[PDB]
Amino acid sequence: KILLEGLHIKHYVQDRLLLNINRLKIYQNDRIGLIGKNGSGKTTLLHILYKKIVPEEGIVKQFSHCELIPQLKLIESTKSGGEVTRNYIRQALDKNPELLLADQPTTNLDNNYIEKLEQDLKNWHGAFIIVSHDRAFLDNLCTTIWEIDEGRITEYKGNYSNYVEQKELERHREELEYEKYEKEKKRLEKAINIKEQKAQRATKKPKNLSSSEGKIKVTKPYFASKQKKLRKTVKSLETRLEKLERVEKRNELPPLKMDLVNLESVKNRTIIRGEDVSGTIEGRVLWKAKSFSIRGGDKMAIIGSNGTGKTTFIKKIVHGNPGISLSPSVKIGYFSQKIDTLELDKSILENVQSSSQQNETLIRTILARMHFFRDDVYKPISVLSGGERVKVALTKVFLSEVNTLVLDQPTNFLDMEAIEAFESLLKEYNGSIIFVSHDRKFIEKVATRIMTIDNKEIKIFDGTY
Amino acid sequence: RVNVTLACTECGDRNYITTKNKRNNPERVEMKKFCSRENKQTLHRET
RNA sequence: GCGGGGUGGAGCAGUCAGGUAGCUCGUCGGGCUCAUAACCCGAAGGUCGUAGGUUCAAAUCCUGCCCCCGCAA
RNA sequence: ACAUAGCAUAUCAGAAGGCACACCCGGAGAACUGAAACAUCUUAGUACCCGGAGGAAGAGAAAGAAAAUUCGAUUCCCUUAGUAGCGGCGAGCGAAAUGGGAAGAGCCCAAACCAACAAGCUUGCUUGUUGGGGUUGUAGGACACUCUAUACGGAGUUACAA
RNA sequence: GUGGAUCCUGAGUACGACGGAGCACGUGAAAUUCCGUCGGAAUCUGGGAGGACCAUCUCCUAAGGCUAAAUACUCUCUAGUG
RNA sequence: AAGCAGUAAAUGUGGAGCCGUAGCGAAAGCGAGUCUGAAUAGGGCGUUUAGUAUUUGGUCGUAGACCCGAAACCAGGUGAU
RNA sequence: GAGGGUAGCGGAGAAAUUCCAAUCGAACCUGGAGAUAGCUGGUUCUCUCCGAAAUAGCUUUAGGGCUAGCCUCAAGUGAUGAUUAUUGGAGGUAGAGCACUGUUUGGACGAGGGGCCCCGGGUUACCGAAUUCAGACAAACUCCGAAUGCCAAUUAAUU
RNA sequence: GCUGGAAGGUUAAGAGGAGUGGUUAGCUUCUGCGAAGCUACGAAUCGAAGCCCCAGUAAACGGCGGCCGUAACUAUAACGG
RNA sequence: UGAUAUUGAAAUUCGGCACAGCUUGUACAGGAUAGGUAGGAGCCUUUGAAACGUGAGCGCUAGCUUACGUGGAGGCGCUGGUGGGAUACUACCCUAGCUGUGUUGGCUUUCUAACCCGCACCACUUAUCGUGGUGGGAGACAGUGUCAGGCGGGCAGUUUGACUGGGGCGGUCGCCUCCUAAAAGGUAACGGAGGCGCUCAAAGGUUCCCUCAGAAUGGUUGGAAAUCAUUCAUAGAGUGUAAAGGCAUAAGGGAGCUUGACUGCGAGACCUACAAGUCGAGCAGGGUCGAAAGACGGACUUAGUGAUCCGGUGGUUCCGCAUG
RNA sequence: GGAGGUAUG
Ligand SMILES: Nc1ncnc2c1ncn2[C@@H]1O[C@H](COP(=O)(O)OP(=O)(O)OP(=O)(O)O)[C@@H](O)[C@H]1O
Ligand SMILES: Nc1ncnc2c1ncn2[C@@H]1O[C@H](COP(=O)(O)OP(=O)(O)OP(=O)(O)O)[C@@H](O)[C@H]1O
Ligand SMILES: [K+]
Ligand SMILES: [K+]
Ligand SMILES: [K+]
Ligand SMILES: [Mg+2]
Ligand SMILES: [Mg+2]
Ligand SMILES: [Mg+2]
Ligand SMILES: [Mg+2]
Ligand SMILES: [Mg+2]
Ligand SMILES: [Mg+2]
Ligand SMILES: [Mg+2]
Ligand SMILES: [Mg+2]
Ligand SMILES: [Mg+2]
Ligand SMILES: [Mg+2]
Ligand SMILES: [Mg+2]
Ligand SMILES: [Mg+2]
Ligand SMILES: [Mg+2]
Ligand SMILES: [Mg+2]
Ligand SMILES: [Mg+2]
Ligand SMILES: [Mg+2]
Ligand SMILES: [Zn+2]
């Protein structure tokens, strides 16, 4: 079967072309891993295919019906992240879609429910498109891969490893062909120059030619025709040079580079302390009353399954002093598991500068390192993609005057090439950080005081393994 | 900055062409213009 | 007259596509050593030739000027 | 190994080959040129080569033109008309029907079926040759039925037998 | 001449796909018609055509042969002409 | 016109056909007015009559097209004395 | 030396673009064929009337062409043409001038810097400038502005 | 360039036949729906060599560097970057 | 190089479809291996519960599966709790594998009978041709035909600008504005200087209001140059963007409302070889603003473009090869 | 207990 078609779709999103798509087709028994950097067009495209978002230009026709488990879900913090996402997955696979459209289904999950989900989707016989950035997840799940580069949807039979391999060889092939072109052009231009020198020599008299030979004046046309011959040859070479197949570099974006403006670190004997924090809401012991203490320079981590209470632990840190003992030195930078920014505040600039006191050029430069360009920092914050909302939250919380960072689910929507910058920044941060994350392999670099919540009790050790 | 075809929101007839910044006026732009069939000045969106 | 260039002391990236100036050797102080070299630890040293504009942001784009290299003359 | 090439002997107004620097049918088939260059296109299915036949050739008695009160083989002249169309919609190529005239002519086979003979010798009735019969669209014929009539007639060696 | 019980009325044929040509008609919406390859019908309640294709209505009855005339030319013979 | 008769004649015959008498509009179509157009407005093109047949001359087109004059291209053949 | 073989979209070549019947950047003959020639040359008797052009625009166009412009013939309109007188008008030239734009001389002050001496103060000096007196430059300066030429006229005359 | 390798990718004819569309026997409630049949298009998927790719080959094609500093005269620089 | 005829017979093997059977189903938490739905409070039990043992399948190494022998009465569930979802039990089904019956092809070889042997021998025959015959080899490949892809100066047909102080290089080719340009207009050169291939949903339309730059002086972060206050100042500012011509009775700068950056046209004019380009009152329709008069078919003006053929998209009281 | 081979100054 077919299940869907899309024809001559153009989605400009602003002046910039986001998507130029032809003969989009996703048939029965089809399992597609869609990928691209932040801001590439993934969530937008899937919304178009689910018909929720009609484009500026083009046709879509779905033959079998669909279900779109959403991202940036608009639903209030009555439950935990992860639990919400579990609920939406369950909705989808209850509804019997025959095409499942997933934009980041692995958000705020635990590895265990992830394992159930990959098992469900291997046992699954329908179709799907899926967006994760989880390498092993896709390597298990998918059969086809799509790449959004600049609206151009490149298709790739196999596994995310095959994507890496194919794109590697294509990058390499392209660079080599470019070097070949440059080298050839260089050579022919040099030839042109030499041949022109000779052509200019052709007409000028020699040296030490006396009276009778100099007064000779009949041979001017002979030499002029010889000069025309050599210059005709330069014309031939220039023609060849034009007939060369021009070939470009890719305008490759500069890499991600995050910053922390300064921590004048003091490293004193203790930053946080607390004792017997009764962890509950009502009728539920989320965790036992326990103490804790955090010291100068600690890359504290948290590891817990769903519905444990990591988020609430961090909320107890950030507000209230029940069994807590803080100091006036620590100035928390709170990055939430939710947005924390102002949606329709009329600029990233404003929403950031609210909490920081620094120069416009430094802040727009940091945003430019995050790849928010000159005309993009006035974009609203609601319009944005998830990963770039996350980046802007992080920047606001960096340029906040802080020394301890408190990060509930970072690295969540971000891409594989900003999570590495983030990995390295946190590795190299002279100060304290506290955070949640389900990625032990991210944590391998980072953690120095690993925690673990489980079974309504707590444990805390030091170092990785 | 790009070409633009308008169209009436009660018959569907284009009736006008113009131009706009796709940056500064990004949305599906709409203005009231005469429509030669209804013989009334009618709201015409873009298509 | 035409065409390329001028980024700490030397040689090279970065300019095409504007987003916090980088690499090797060197220089300075301290170490090791019987002393010097190597080696180990730190630190300086760059109005990106200059003067104007555009930009929130200039080595980067535009202008003008002073040199350097070839060709010529 | 039967017999099959092959080989030997007799008979043919049997063929060949020439041409009228013409006419016709078929094979195979250019380029200069023009397009203000050129490659599709044109030149041109032209010229040259080749085969064959005739005094004429070819085509030809609708699996057709058409669209009214329809016409009744073909071919050829006129006119339709440089129209309709074909066309790098460029250069340019370019009809036909209708309608008016010359001339006018229509016939035979295959199949069904009958009969004789031969192979199977079903000894049942399948196959083949011969002779009969029969040939078309407002469907026809075999098959059965009724009238005739055995050259009275009718037609012929330009088709319809020679 | 009547009758309509059954039998017969042209097969690797028509047609189609591909490639080509020829039809005034350059593949074009390309009907009609030949060739090569491959595949492959129907059977008178049939088959074909009326410029893609379908239906209706009308006209014929493919895949088998013969057929003068009117038309073309002139080596040549005769009689003549400008 | 062809064709028929006629002395290779004129001439007779033949009215298929052709131009014209009505245009406008892409066309359906309407009609001295039509097309545009909402319009009876305005405008375009037309009306408010003479064309036709043969022919002299001139010019143009198609045919070698005022004469001569290439280097060259193609096809078929002749040449190793 | 003989007898012979290889044939032109070819053959032979101890290789030179060399030979293939006194010429080979692809033989000779015939035909297509009167190839094509925007190129040169030539184009035959007389008289009469009128009588140019060598310019614009476009042109794979520049020594070719098409259209206009200038010519001739015919039919028609019918004084609409020419010249001058007068009136009016548009326009910024030669000249002249410095009222702006830029250039420039010599002065009077200076606006305050700079080199140098000891916070301030000096200087046989640049003077960036500002102002002012006098004299000067201009195709792309003009407060001004001719003669001519032009466009017309309910005008007159000559043609 | 040639030689070998052959994983993977891209890649035709043909095989395959999802889906769209035309007609219409019947239904219709307003003029819409529309079986089969015949038709015009026709996707996914399969689908060789080649190409991308890996290696080798130079009596194969072919190619063979700059700038700066430096030693008992100064020049040069065995030497260094 | 591949498909397809020539072009056959056998089989292993691998796959896809159907049907039958053996079954098989572990995220974390939870009593532990929780497949889907429904029914579900009883199911099993001397026709043998638990427990002991082997054998054996699966397996995530937890454990379930079941052929059995000893054994002889409990074992399991709703409830409980957990968890997204409840366990017994049963009806039907699904995943995954295996097995089987049948289809369905494919690769793979095997064979011989087509086809092939410039293999041998025999005869025609005296013959190195050929034909036939026999025997060996190869074999449904090759070779041949049609269709398709790739390579392919081996070969052919052709293209491969113009201007221009000779040609050539260099430069230019179209459009806009100044000067040359000789006071109308027009006017050339490889004469001199510069720009264009856009931009603006307001920088348009309209109605209201406002008038600049620069200097002196006073004043914090000091050329007091930022911003302010006054006086002077008629244009030296600004006019999106080149220059010129113009605008301060604003064409410049702000504010409010809007979409005339409308439809159908268009007398008469400019320029003009043509094709095109420009201006355009005014009429009608239907309107924004303004109290009204009235302004408004873009922008202070002049550049900001590209013929036809062709194809694409939309609409239509247009044809539609007999009729529809 | 002894013999033989097996970085600068
Ligand atoms: N309405 C809008 N206007 C302007 N920019 C927009 C608009 N909507 C989206 N964008 C920008 O275009 C891109 C939108 O793509 P999309 O939301 O699909 O991203 P994504 O692939 O889902 O990203 P991520 O991995 O961050 O979730 C982002 O760059 C976003 O900033
Ligand atoms: N208002 C509330 N009412 C009831 N329960 C709540 C409320 N807020 C939170 N909870 C529950 O408290 C627990 C909080 O979970 P929390 O978000 O802290 O966990 P976590 O470690 O971040 O896990 P994850 O994000 O992966 O779900 C969850 O059980 C959540 O359902
Ligand atoms: K055809
Ligand atoms: K017919
Ligand atoms: K000779
Ligand atoms: Mg997303
Ligand atoms: Mg949470
Ligand atoms: Mg030509
Ligand atoms: Mg055929
Ligand atoms: Mg000779
Ligand atoms: Mg000829
Ligand atoms: Mg005279
Ligand atoms: Mg003067
Ligand atoms: Mg002057
Ligand atoms: Mg060649
Ligand atoms: Mg030619
Ligand atoms: Mg020239
Ligand atoms: Mg010259
Ligand atoms: Mg000269
Ligand atoms: Mg003038
Ligand atoms: Mg019809
Ligand atoms: Zn409307």
Concise account of the structure shown:
In chain A, 36% of the residues lie in helices and 17% in strands.
Annotation field: number of helices of chain A: 13
Strand content of chain A: 15-25%
| Rg of chain A | 31 Å
Relevant CATH superfamily of chain B: Ribosomal protein L33
Largest sheet data of chain B = 4 strands, antiparallel
Q: Strand order, biggest sheet of chain B?
A: 2-1-4-3
What distance lies between the first and last C-alpha atoms of chain A, to the nearest angstrom? 50 Å
PDB class: ribosome
Keywords: Antibiotic resistance element, abcf, antibiotic resistance, ATPase, protein synthesis, ribosome
Entry title: VgaA-LC, an antibiotic resistance ABCF, in complex with 70S ribosome from Staphylococcus aureus
Chain A: Lincosamide-streptogramin A resistance protein
SSE layout and pairing:
This is part of a larger assembly, with chains A (465 residues) and B (47 residues).
Chain A: E1 4-12, E2 17-21, E3 24-25, E4 31-35, H1 42-49, E5 57-62, E6 67-69, H2 83-95, E7 100-103, H3 111-123, E8 128-131, H4 135-141, E9 144-148, E10 153-157, H5 160-201, H6 211-215, H7 220-243, E11 272-274, E12 279-280, E13 285-287, E14 292-294, H8 310-318, E15 324-325, E16 332-335, H9 348-353, H10 360-369, H11 386-399, E17 404-407, H12 419-428, E18 432-435, H13 440-446, E19 451-454, E20 457-460
Parallel strand pairs in A: 4-8, 4-9, 6-7, 7-8, 16-17, 17-18
Antiparallel strand pairs in A: 1-2, 1-3, 1-5, 9-10, 11-14, 11-15, 12-13, 19-20
Chain B: E1 2-8, E2 17-20, E3 30-35, E4 40-46
Antiparallel strand pairs in B: 1-2, 1-4, 3-4
One magnesium ion binds next to helix 1 of chain A.
The structure holds 8 RNA strands.
Please give a structural write-up.
Chain A: Keywords: ATP-binding, Coiled coil, Metal-binding, Nucleotide-binding, Repeat. Chain A is of the alpha/beta class and 465 residues long. Chain A has helices spanning 42-49, 83-95, 111-123, 135-141, 160-201, 211-215, 220-243, 310-318, 348-353, 360-369, 386-399, 419-428, 440-446; strands spanning 4-12, 17-21, 24-25, 31-35, 57-62, 67-69, 100-103, 128-131, 144-148, 153-157, 272-274, 279-280, 285-287, 292-294, 324-325, 332-335, 404-407, 432-435, 451-454, 457-460. In chain A, strand 17 (404-407), helix 12 (419-428) and strand 18 (432-435) form a beta-alpha-beta unit. In chain A, helix 5 (160-201) packs antiparallel against helix 7 and helix 12 packs parallel to helix 13 (440-446). Chain B is an all-beta fold. Chain B has one domain (1-46): Rubrerythrin, domain 2 (Single Sheet), CATH 2.20.28. Chain B has no helices and 4 strands. Chain B has strands spanning 2-8, 17-20, 30-35, 40-46. A 4-stranded antiparallel sheet of chain B has the order 2-1-4-3, with no helix packed on it. At the A-B interface, loops of A face loops of B. The structure holds adenosine-5'-triphosphate (2 copies), potassium ion (3 copies), magnesium ion (16 copies) and zinc ion. The structure holds 8 RNA strands.
